[PDB]
């Protein structure tokens, strides 16, 4: 019930964060390796396509594909939106994390000339979290609705929304209503209040 | 670059929020008292920030209830009264600050209820 | 959730036994017909250095001849225990990618033969009565396992805090999920990277200088299923 | 300075001599497992659940009880004191009896958890457990005793909160019982306080024995308005319906405990509730009927009649806001006579000054006085978390308890010096014996339970204890920050009223009557039909209906302090919110809207439309109601007491007495409460 | 205090956007009508664009307007293209729903809510 | 019209409401004897500069702030009001 | 080893309020 | 009426529900079924109650009957035991 794991990585991979964080000083706040054995260089927004190209086109250090670009929204931190992009090297056989910070009028940059895989994610980005990301081509909602005002997955939005729709024979169309939910989600206060010893 | 701006960051037209929902509706940022049933103070550390209680209602058929406040299950979770004020301010919502309730310090001692 | 019934293991041996001949009764009726070959072959060719940088990462990224599995590269369970060939591509076709995804039904029956061979005797779930639930007359005999289970199903297990990003090979190409966790039992964000957001983007790249018929070709050969690109 | 260094897992704390080992862990932020040890409650050392590894020493101790040394380093997550903790959860849960889906105490457990996060994956108990009998300890308390873990916080509270030694151990070995040996019943107010104590769900409530479970319940954070201590609360709510009233700390007011009444009462909120606005019809029977109908037969009769023809006699539970909305409304209308049914004197300086009628040491005062005499109140039965406060400082402190009223049972030690009022005149002339007694306090606290001055001579009895209180004042040679005179008050809306500018008693509606009433909530027999013009044209403002809807012309349905974001202050001025629990039933209306809106219909509309303008409003008039959890001090007596010098009365012989003498008195005195199910099983369990 | 410019430097610079756009739909609303077959009447329409445009008039934070413009042409774009159908741009409109009273005693009159 | 009643505000510690402090130590305690039966509320201000309201007959009032007012002046001022 | 028995649901709930029944007789 | 009322009052619209139909209300009312039970007599002080069964059954729990003033019931069957 303890992991089998192996400590060769956590060496290993911590040895490239200080390589990266020595390359490109000018970008990379802090770098971590977890105890999950994974990797995260954390850069400042400007650094998004600097260290994602850095990371794209060296030798040592081949991270050809995107696998995911995502924001966690934590509401308190002044800067919400935390992007995060998850990239894998086929050459070393690793994956690392470049995650930057992006707040509701701040645009961070768009990587989709460094990786053509981001230029849906950055749209559904825009779409659920409202981060906009500069000279992308075409961003636009990829998953909400044509008409849908509002962004989604923040975590100040309702879990159900404020409209919903039916259809209005009176109109014959598809009208939206502001929600009635004939039973409102109970929400349950479930949380120990006894914390873990850590 | 670097232009300057004097205001607080209104984003309430761009956070698409129905009016009446931005306009007659009071947050109150607090931080959460203990469940008197439980001694676990794990659960008042973190600032609250909990939106007004509108109508709660009866579906007529299964009796269920129903409601219409789309922001009645919201309860945003801050680490600071600044950084709740902020967010309040931020989405254009009316805020009630309520300053936290840490107890006082009792002194105990196991020998005092010996004494005569 | 519970041990596998007394018969699964002789039924699903039942079925791989016969399972072979039906996979080429479906290869002879579609790998040599002139009408298939044509129809796939030299359709939505993807180049092996834009299959990785448009994040392809599936049997779209084998079927280009590129070497990487995630079941050989990184292994997860105990595939690091079972012998299996990855059928990698040449053409980065149609075609080709229809013969791999042929060969992972052939290469997966060698991977289901040596798991009901070597199946070890066990339990099914970890015994930390503080993330697998306790038993059913375990919860009903000792006042430990009632308090367990009462807490696991109404509260949870409330996962440490941290984050990870964990790839699988799923059929369809690289699953992963990027789970943030704050201390508590639910969840904060759990990113579900789909292989098929990227393939999808890939369509058009991929179906360029290509007439209205090979398009429903395009969108078979990425196994594109909606629900993992829209989530 | 006399910190001493004491390590927490290394964070090296500075504590002050004395602090135990559990007090070192919470200051650095670690939590001892614990159970039987409470703050408010003495270390007993029962459970040993907190046992830690202070460094380099020999055995485990108990973080409960060991005075932290000079640089002991705690370790409270080494592999020895999580064997200490492994080891104990394997024995309070060997003899507990597996029902945790009977015990509604499910996820209000501090006893799985524990087990769930410090405790052990399995059970080696392979052996028979115990069973105890159930007994009946009252109509309020389950004690479903075989879940008992003899953590003697109830026999402690039993005994140190409430003085109520009823409850004690008996026997020993395993077979030890914590219960009362003869069944009588626990009967006390701070009864119910029990139920939220005992961490274990081996007693819990009856009322919410099976309705609810934890997690569902949202929980809405209010205050009490059964009594004028204010005391917090949490109202949970399920789907809409309020389920539980439990406690909320405010160091303060109320700290972790609340009143019998204002727990178990909240059953009384939801039946002969006020919901649909009838008008009397017909041959005279009342008519259910739209507002538009039932506000314009209101306004008709209000623009006919003049001002001191309409009058309005509020009372009981109305909130500050509606208060503001019915003197604004009746003083658009020359009628400036806005009443409460409480009489407090107002023959002298009255409401002018705050000071006169507000407790001026606070409820946290009683902790630092020395000497208290309490003249014409049974505490413990008007406001009871302050009798509690007596008792703490009466206890852990030392005060000097006088009673000054009938000898009545008080929970503590009290000297009658008698009942009469005139003596009160005897401690000025410094004849009766207790005189010296305050000489020799430095510090203390006089205390006029509204309660008295409902008599006819309570215009007496206030300047008679004004006169005692300043030269006590003199004698003493008090600081001027202490303020020896305070009056505690047992109705939740009189501070606010008389703060508001409301004239107390219905002594001016007695002398004219009004052609018109709109009883605020007021179910008070303070007038009645029979004694109004025949025109008699009355209409009730309130939420239960109890004695003034019957004699009613019109009714307007109001709420319930569950029900609304009124405020509300206690005696000692401290204003507070309640806050919306549940949304007011059927077309049932908050207060301070019903009169914006009959102010709208009769045209005299008043300014604000939204509830922060009618907050702002309060501002002008009152503008600390606008400040909350704030008690201000400029104590302006001395000028109080001038006019009180000019004010010449009689104190009329007739001993003054507390209408509460025994608890049944108790029990039921309100819309919300005497309309309880629950109260009234409680009313006839004591009879 | 300074703040990095979304894509205009000083309102004014941005106005020239909003502008930019209000000249876009006002010259789209023609074409919605008659082509997603709409019946509301060009006049009406281009009321409602006005509405809009006006809503938003009046925050001072360019990078708020430099926001709302962006979100504002890819509306158009949308509704330039088919990719809304009726349904979505009729929805502009409130045609099923009640507008709520506003009047206190129209309120009060109706819902505990305010 | 008729003065009803008159609420006097006043903080508790500032200099604007210093000496409207001292009125009260001064006159309250003659003004009530004088003119008594006319609600002289004293109330407590906050962060706000002393003020005296007072109703009058229908609903009406009227304000005059007294920030930084000396004594005499507030006493006059309470006595222009009880004309 | 068009029905008319269709179920139909409730509130089994026992209706969780009371309203004042007013006086029967006037005064 | 259920074995919980829920019957619906003659005035109550609530009852179109039920035309052209009818409603679902089992006939098996488990107050009277356990009271249709013989009283468990026993030897012992306490005893258990698995519900009949072992894990099949009901979480087990030992019942005090000690007290032949009242047999004892399991929370979970409304099985009265009689010492
Ligand atoms: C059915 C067919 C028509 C469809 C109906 C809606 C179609 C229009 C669609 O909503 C697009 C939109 O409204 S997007 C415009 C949003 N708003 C802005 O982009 C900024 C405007 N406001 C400001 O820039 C400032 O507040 C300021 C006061 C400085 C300018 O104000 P002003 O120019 O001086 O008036
Ligand atoms: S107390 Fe009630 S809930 Fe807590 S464990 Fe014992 S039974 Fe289960
Ligand atoms: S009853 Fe509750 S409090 Fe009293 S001892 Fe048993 S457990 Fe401890
Ligand atoms: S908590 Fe320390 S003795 Fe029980
Ligand atoms: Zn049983």
Known sequence: ???????????????????????????????????????????????????????????????????????????????????????????????????????????????????????????????MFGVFFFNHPDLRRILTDYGFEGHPFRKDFPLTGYVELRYDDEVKRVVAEPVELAQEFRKFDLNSPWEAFP | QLITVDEKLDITTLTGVPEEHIKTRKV????????????????????????????????????????????????????????????????????????????????????????? | ???????????????????????????????????????????????????????????????????????????????????????????????????????????????????????????????????????????????????????????????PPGATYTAIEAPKGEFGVYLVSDGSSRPYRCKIKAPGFAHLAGLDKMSKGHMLADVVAIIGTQDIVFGEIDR | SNLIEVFVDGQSVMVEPGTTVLQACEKVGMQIPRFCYHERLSVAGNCRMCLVEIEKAPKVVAACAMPVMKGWNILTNSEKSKKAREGVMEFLLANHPLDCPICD??????????????????????????????????????????????????????????????????????????????????????????????????????????????????????????????????????????????????????????????????????????????????????????????????????????????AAIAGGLVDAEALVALKDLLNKVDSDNLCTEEIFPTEGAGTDLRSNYLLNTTIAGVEEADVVLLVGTNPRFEAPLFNARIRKSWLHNDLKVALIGSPVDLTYRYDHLGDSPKILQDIASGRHSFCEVLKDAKKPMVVLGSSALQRDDGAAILVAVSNMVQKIRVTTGVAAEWKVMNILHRIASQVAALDLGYKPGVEAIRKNPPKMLFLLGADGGCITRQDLPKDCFIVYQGHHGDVGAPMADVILPGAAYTEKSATYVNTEGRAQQTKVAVTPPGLAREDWKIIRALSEIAGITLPYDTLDQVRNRLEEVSPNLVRYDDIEETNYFQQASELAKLVNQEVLADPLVPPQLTIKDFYMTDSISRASQTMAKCVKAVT | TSVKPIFSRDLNEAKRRVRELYRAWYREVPNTVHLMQLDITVK???????????????????RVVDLLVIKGKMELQETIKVWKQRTHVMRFFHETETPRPKDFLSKFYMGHDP | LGLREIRVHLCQRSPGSQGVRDFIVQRYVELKKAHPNLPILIRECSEVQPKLWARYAFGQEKTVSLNNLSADEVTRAMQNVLS | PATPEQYVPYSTTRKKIHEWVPPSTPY | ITHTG???????????????????????????????????????????????????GHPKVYINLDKETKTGTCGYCGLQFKQ
Not at chain 2, 49 to 74: C, H, Q, V, Y
Not at chain 3, 90 to 105: A, H, I, N, P, T
Not at chain 4, 131 to 148: F, Q, S
């Open chain 4, 105 to 310: 105490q499910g996820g209000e457990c501090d006893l799985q958890d524990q087990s769930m996060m410090f405790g052990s994956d399995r059970s080696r108990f392979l052996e028979g457990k115990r069973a105890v009998e159930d007994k009946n300890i009252g109509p309020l308390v389950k004690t479903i005793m075989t879940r008992c873990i003899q953590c003697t916080r109830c026999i402690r509270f039993a005994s140190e909160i409430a003085g109520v030694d009823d409850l004690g151990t008996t026997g020993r070995g395993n077979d030890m019982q914590v219960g009362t040996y003869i069944e009588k019943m626990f009967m006390s107010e701070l009864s119910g306080n029990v139920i939220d104590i005992c961490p274990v769900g081996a007693l819990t409530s009856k009322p919410y024995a099976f309705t609810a479970r934890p997690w569902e319940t949202r929980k809405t954070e209010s205050i009490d308005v059964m009594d004028a201590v204010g005391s917090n609360i949490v109202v949970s709510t399920r789907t809409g319906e309020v389920m539980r009233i439990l406690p909320r700390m405010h160091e303060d007011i109320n700290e972790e405990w609340i009143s019998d009444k204002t727990r178990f009462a909240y059953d009384g909120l939801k039946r002969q509730r006020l919901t649909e606005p009838m008008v009397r019809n017909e041959k005279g029977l009342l008519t259910y009927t739209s507002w538009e109908d039932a506000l314009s037969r209101v306004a008709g009769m209000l623009q006919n009649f003049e001002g001191n023809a309409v």
């Open chain 5, 44 to 62: 009406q329409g281009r009321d409602k664009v006005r509405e809009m445009f006006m809503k938003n008039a009046h925050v001072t934070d360019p």
């Open chain 2, 28 to 116: 109150r940022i607090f931080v959460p008292a203990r469940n008197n049933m439980q001694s676990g103070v794990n659960n008042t550390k973190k600032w609250k920030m909990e939106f007004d209680t509108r109508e709660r209602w009866e579906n007529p058929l299964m009796g269920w209830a129903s409601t219409a406040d789309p922001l009645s299950n919201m309860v945003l979770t801050f680490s600071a009264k600044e950084d709740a004020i902020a967010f309040a301010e931020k989405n254009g919502w009316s805020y009630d600050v309520e300053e936290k309730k840490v107890p006082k310090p009792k002194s105990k001692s196991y020998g005092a209820n010996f004494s005569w």
């Open chain 8, 6 to 56: 829920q019957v619906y009052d003659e005035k109550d619209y609530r009852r179109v529900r039920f035309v052209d139909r009818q409603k679902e209300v089992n006939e098996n009312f488990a107050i009277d079924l356990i009271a249709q039970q013989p009283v468990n007599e026993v030897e012992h002080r306490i005893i258990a109650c698995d519900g009949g069964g072992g894990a099949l």
């Open chain 1, 1 to 127: 019930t303890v992991r089998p794991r192996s400590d060769v990585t956590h060496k290993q991979l911590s040895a490239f964060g200080e390589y990266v964080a020595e390359i490109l000083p000018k970008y990379v706040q802090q770098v971590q390796v977890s105890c999950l054995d994974e990797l995260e260089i954390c850069i400042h927004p400007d650094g998004v396509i600097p260290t994602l190209t850095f990371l794209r086109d060296h030798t040592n250090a081949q991270f050809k594909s995107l696998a995911d670009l995502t924001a966690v929204d934590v509401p308190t931190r002044q800067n919400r939106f935390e992007i995060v992009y998850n990239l894998l090297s086929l050459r070393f056989n690793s994956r690392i994390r470049v995650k930057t910070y992006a707040d509701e009028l701040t645009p961070i940059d768009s990587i989709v000339s460094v990786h053509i895989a981001a230029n849906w994610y950055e749209r559904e980005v825009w779409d």
């Open chain 3, 1 to 159: 959730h519970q041990d596998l019934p007394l018969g699964l293991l002789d039924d699903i041996y039942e079925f791989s036994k016969n399972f072979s001949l039906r996979i080429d009764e479906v290869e002879e009726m579609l790998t040599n017909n002139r009408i298939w070959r044509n129809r796939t072959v030299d359709i939505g060719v993807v180049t092996a250095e834009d299959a990785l940088n448009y994040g392809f990462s599936g049997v779209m990224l084998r079927g280009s001849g590129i070497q990487w599995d995630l079941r050989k590269t990184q292994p997860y369970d105990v595939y690091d225990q079972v012998e299996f060939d990855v059928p990698i591509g040449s053409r980065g076709d149609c075609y080709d990618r229809y013969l791999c995804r042929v060969e992972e039904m052939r290469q997966s029956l060698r991977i289901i033969e040596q798991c009901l061979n070597k199946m070890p005797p066990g339990e099914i779930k970890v015994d930390d009565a503080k993330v697998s639930p306790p038993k059913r007359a375990e919860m009903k005999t000792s006042m430990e396992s009632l308090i367990h289970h009462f807490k696991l199903y109404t509260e949870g297990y409330q996962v």
